[PDB]
Amino acid sequence: SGGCNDIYCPKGTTCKMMDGHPQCVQNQPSCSDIQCSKGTTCQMVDGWPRCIQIKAAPSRPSCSDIHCPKGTTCKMIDGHPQCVQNQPTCSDIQCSKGTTCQMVDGWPRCTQLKVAPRRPS
């Protein structure tokens, strides 16, 4: 076997040699049963899985470190994980960040963020 006997999550899990480190792949929903790219947590929010690494777990690429509010999905934009919200915050209406994408009621008005990190927007 793996180091499952060395790393047994709270029983009720099921560890296996996970690529060289025993991962308790839950004998219940595997923490990664839903698509929460390990490193993230096991988020199935009552049927709305949002894998968001807020739990400061061993810091490896944490797609969500800078995690926009719920409904947001972290991507790596130029490497600085920026949410491309599920209903994308800005990349929905093409106006590269620096502007906002404030469609006001269906009038995309990319606002130069009156107060964004000082960038040439």
Write down the residue that tokens 């209903």 correspond to: 87
DSSP 8-state symbol, 3: S
Half-sphere exposure of 58 (CA within 13 A, CB side): 3
Q: Do the beta carbons of residue 33 and residue 18 sit within 8 Å?
A: no
Q: Kindly state the helix (H) or strand (E) to which residue 18 belongs, with its residue range.
A: strand 15-18
The alpha carbon dihedral of 67, 73, 76, 82 has a sign of negative
- Residue 72 token pair: 């947001």
The structure's method of determination equals NMR
Instruction: Specify the amino acid at residue 86.
Output: N
- Residue 62 token pair: 């944490």
Alpha helices (H) in the chain, listed in sequence order: none
117 by Cβ neighbours in 10 Å (0-12 / 13-18 / 19+) ranks as exposed
Write down the residue that tokens 């709305």 correspond to: 48
Distance, CA of 63 to CA of 81 (rounded, Å): 6
Half-sphere exposure of 18 (CA within 13 A, CB side): 18
Half-sphere exposure of 79 (CA within 13 A, CB side): 0
Q: Do the beta carbons of residue 64 and residue 76 sit within 8 Å?
A: no
- Residue 36 token pair: 């929460």
